[PDB]
Amino acid sequence: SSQGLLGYYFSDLNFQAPMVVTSSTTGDLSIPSSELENIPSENQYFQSAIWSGFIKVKKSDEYTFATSADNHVTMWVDDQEVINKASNSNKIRLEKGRLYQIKIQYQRENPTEKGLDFKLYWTDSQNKKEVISSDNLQLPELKQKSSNSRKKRSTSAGPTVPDRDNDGIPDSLEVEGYTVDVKNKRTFLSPWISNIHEKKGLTKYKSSPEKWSTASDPYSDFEKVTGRIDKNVSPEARHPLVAAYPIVHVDMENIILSKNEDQSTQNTDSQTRTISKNTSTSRTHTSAGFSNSNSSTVAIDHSLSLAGERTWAETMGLNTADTARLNANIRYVNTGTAPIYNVLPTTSLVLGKNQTLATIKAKENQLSQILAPNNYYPSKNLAPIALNAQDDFSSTPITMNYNQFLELEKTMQLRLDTDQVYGNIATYNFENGRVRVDTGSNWSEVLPQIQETTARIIFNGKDLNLVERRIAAVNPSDPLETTKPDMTLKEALKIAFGFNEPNGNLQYQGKDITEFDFNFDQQTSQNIKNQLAELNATNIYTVLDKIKLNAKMNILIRDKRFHYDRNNIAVGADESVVKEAHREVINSSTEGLLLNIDKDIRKILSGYIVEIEDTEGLKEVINDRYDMLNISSLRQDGKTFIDFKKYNDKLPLYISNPNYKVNVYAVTKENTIINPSENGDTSTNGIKKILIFSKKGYEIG
Ligand SMILES: [Ca+2]
Ligand SMILES: [Ca+2]
């Protein structure tokens, strides 16, 4: 369906103004006027055309080639003229299982009909003539290298289509701007016209005529826009200016700690004394940063999960010479734009700033599924990976010594550093028109070039998680790079993140761009500052269309509502923001609160503190422990219930006097206490908390 001959249709007689670039499955190379909706009626007259590709014969014979316009045609087979402005009865021997280059040129001055009715025929020795079938035709080898059987360049005889990078799109089209128009059976590539295409809302593409892949990634500009590409590649990365490459980090879902057995203790019948905790993991970025690394930071839930208030050593019976080990459930996460097939990158589990506790590896070439973009390995419909799997004898115990154990208890955090080793790439093959994992193609050969020639934007508009995209961008100092189209900050956001302009105001999912901040690495900031000064602009938000991106820029764009830590994880928000987010009270009673809270807001809250304030201003805190804040839960209808009874010995609030108040406070992640105070205090005393509800007993009901 994606196979056949490649056709170039021109409105001039000398192959200079290409109007349509498309492919035909069979020897019918015709384009009826009905398919020329995206072309000015003036430009629907084709005075010249060129087709190229390959013919494969299934049975050796003497073949005579012909077209419907022999008098206007010159045709070459393997550099050999077989038709030249006249019908030829000349027969050529073709051998089964061999591939022959085809090149066909056509010229007709002042056509009276729009479009083109053109067919290519062959005749066998038995005198059977027919339009050359689809099984006998193949596309040209539009790659950076030849196949063993398919040469990547067409014959020198005759006119050479101008395709400096051999991606299939004519030089002039990549520079000037092109659109791709969907048909049922094929794709038309056509010059951009401002009046006709803008009204349609079609995408205007520009690419480098000297870069087979303009984003320096492993898919060609032509492959991208024609759909001759891995279906798992992200939609935005079908734009020639958006890089398609995997981005992987590890998500830890929960953890279990246990004392390591030792040679001195022959007793293995003791009661289980393990410590199990949920965890939350966020990919992180570490002014903006210029390093291309994959890391995530894990937050271990501090809420009490066991009876008593013992130390971990007390709970697990660890003496000072004992060691402990950790088992966790994880998934790999691809937040990039291309899938991973045969390799999962290697991960270090790190405690503190530099300690490494484990090296996490999967079996190469044994993956149970693809790791697709915006997806997980294993899929969320399947069980996660246990670091120590029950079906595997040889999982390395992830062991900590006593002091490391204490440090983990004291910090309640781990780090997962993941390398960028992603294995082989599924590429398109023009010989069979299918996508397959290619042993000859590897991500480690592409990533450095992608990193060197693109601008990086990291954006958290999607659920406050950091998502990185790379957009092809000029490097003034690199001549090859200069050819690529100017990339503006505005265009970048539209094509890479799906920002849209419904009212002429740039928005992401309904949020104006002004609801996000801009942060840059030191060099990018100085660059952007100079651009603004040159533009005489005081406000970046009003000149996004005029701010030009360059290769190696690093841009960080964050939701303004939130406070961010050094890892750019959202950890809090302004008091007024938090208070406003809690203004919609659906229901209140002595058992709790029912509210509609923004999903993003919920993300930065570690919990709630509930208190009764008597008439004299004194306060009874019902959930009086740092580790008892976890009293909120998300209902099925997306509403939040704050549970007064949970840490009130399962009893609703007793309010002695209707004039007393019930005050509820939110505690943000950055204000969360994770360990008892040095004084040993475990109360909520001193916890920075935000009042989000206060009603008297008689107001509550
Ligand atoms: Ca090209
Ligand atoms: Ca190109």
From Swiss-Prot:
One term under GO cellular component: host cell plasma membrane
Site (Phi-clamp): residue numbering on this chain: F393
Record region (Disordered): 133-171, 259-286
Annotated site (Cleavage): R153, S154
Binding site for Ca(2+) 1: D163, D165, D167, I169, E174
Compositionally biased intervals (Polar residues): 263-284
Consequence the record notes for mutating F520A: Decrease in toxicity due to defective oligomerization
Impact reported for N623A: Decrease in toxicity due to decrease in cell binding
Annotated site location: Essential for binding to cell receptor: D649
Variant or mutagenesis effect after changing L318A: Loss of toxicity probably due to faulty membrane insertion or translocation of LF/EF into the cytosol
Pfam family, one: Binary_toxB_3
Chain residue ranges for the region called Alpha-clamp: 188-196
Effect of substituting I193A: Loss of ability to bind to LF and completely non-toxic
Comment field on protein domains: The molecule is folded into four functional domains. Each domain is required for a particular step in the toxicity process. Domain 1 contains two calcium ions and the proteolytic activation site. Cleavage of the PA monomer releases the subdomain 1a, which is the N-terminal fragment of 20-kDa (PA-20). The subdomain 1b is part of the remaining 63-kDa fragment (PA-63) and contains the binding sites for LP and EF. Domain 2 is a beta-barrel core containing a large flexible loop that has been implicated in membrane insertion and pore formation.
Protein family membership: Belongs to the bacterial binary toxin family.
Name by which UniProt lists this protein: Protective antigen
